[PDB]
Amino acid sequence: TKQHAFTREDLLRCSRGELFGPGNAQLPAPNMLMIDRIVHISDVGGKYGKGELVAELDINPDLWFFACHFEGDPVMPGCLGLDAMWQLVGFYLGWQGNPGRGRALGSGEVKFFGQVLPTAKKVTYNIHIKRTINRSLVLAIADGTVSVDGREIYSAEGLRVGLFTSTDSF
Amino acid sequence: TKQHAFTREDLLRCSRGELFGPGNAQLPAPNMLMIDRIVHISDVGGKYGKGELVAELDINPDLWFFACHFEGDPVMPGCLGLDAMWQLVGFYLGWQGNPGRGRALGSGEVKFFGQVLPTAKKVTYNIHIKRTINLVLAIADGTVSVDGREIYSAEGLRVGLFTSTDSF
Ligand SMILES: Clc1ccc(CNc2n[nH]c(-c3ccco3)n2)cc1
Ligand SMILES: Clc1ccc(CNc2n[nH]c(-c3ccco3)n2)cc1
């Protein structure tokens, strides 16, 4: 809760289990990691007054997904930008100090109304936390947008991620 | 519309633009391709009477995503199983003979209530077409199952075809 920004190195450390500790939240490592840095994370402010994350993914044409998706028509998979939002929401829960491993639980409406081309510079994720529930299962609910070089292209309402001290029920 | 099942090699051919032709729908190539075969595709039947797809992805422990997602806790990314459903809905549109390149437009509710482990054998996707609109787009519900067990649902999956993605 004390640190409000994270470098790529921090996120890589997180992916090894070395930021939040063993048994607790881990981001994906590359090539599933869809964030380079967290520019701002807080548990006050945001659209709902319950916290906010802003994060960035640098784009260049040699990112692996461009060559296979699609041949002759390169474009960042929408599913991976969506996943970056789930990644942030999970991270948020770990960052608050909750224990357990992350699993996404889903979302309400998702809309894709733009795209990321290999000639783009930077994708930015804006996440507004709507609610956290610490009752027995720990989860978070949030709204999110994905933008590319200033232009909003995706929205998601009701992103949900949980933490599990035993994922055995999945 | 004439062929009701596709092998992996058909899907690869699709990924190269060589199934539906140039300017028309392409599946992703590996490693974004999340389907090995389409076991059944039709434009009648299904939950809504407007068509159906059943497809499969074989699982083994060496699939690339297991090692990085997550270290010490391998599990297929939910987003990729979701994407498989968008992949199938786009394919459907190309398979009907519509022109243009595919872009997913979103979904209504998505739920993940299970997971794919490296010890699973096979993932199966069931897609029920709800509506096509001829801008061309399709709307569908989908489920993802692993070795018989339903684990994800999506309602209102939407994919469109575009004869120009310059503007998108
Ligand atoms: Cl730090 C952090 C951030 C986000 C997450 C969640 N990511 C996630 N991917 N796939 C699933 C999933 C859910 C069910 C099946 O698969 N969940 C984990 C750790
Ligand atoms: Cl065959 C066939 C099947 C499915 C699709 C769509 N898949 C898809 N991934 N990412 C996007 C997208 C949408 C908006 C931004 O990115 N769309 C294309 C061809």
Residue numbers in the entry:
A (entry chain B): 2 to 171
B (entry chain A): 2 to 135, 138 to 171
Give passages from the manuscript.
FabA, a homologue of FabZ, is an essential enzyme for Gram-negative bacteria. Unlike FabZ, FabA carries out a second enzymatic step, the isomerisation of (E)-2-enoyl-ACP to (Z)-3-enoyl-ACP (trans to cis C3–C4 double bond), an essential reaction to provide unsaturated fatty acids that are furthermore absent in eukaryotes. Further, unlike FabI, there are no isozymes of FabA. This makes FabA a particularly attractive target for drug discovery.
High-throughput screening of the PaFabA enzyme has discovered a new inhibitor, N42FTA, the first non-suicide inhibitor of this important and attractive target. To understand the mechanism of inhibition by N42FTA, we determined its co-crystal structure with PaFabA. N42FTA is bound at the active site formed by the two subunits of the canonical FabA dimer, and it bridges from the A subunit to the B subunit. Therefore, each dimer has two compounds bound. One nitrogen atom of the central triazole ring makes a hydrogen bond with main chain of A195 in the A subunit whilst the other two nitrogen atoms make hydrogen bonds to H70 and G79 in the B subunit. One water (W1), found in all five monomers in the asymmetric unit, bridges from the triazole to the side chain of D84 of the A subunit and the main chain of C80 of the B subunit. A second water (W2), which is absent in two monomers of the asymmetric unit, bridges the triazole ring and the amine of N42FTA to the key catalytic residues H70 of the B subunit and D84 of the A subunit. The chlorobenzene moiety makes very extensive van der Waal contacts filling the hydrophobic tunnel in the A subunit that binds the substrate acyl chain. These data suggest that N42FTA acts by blocking acyl chain substrate binding. Superposition of the N42FTA complex with the structure of H70N (inactive) PaFabA bound to 3-hydroxydecanoyl-NAC reveals that the triazole occupies the same volume as the thioester group of 3-hydroxydecanoyl-NAC.
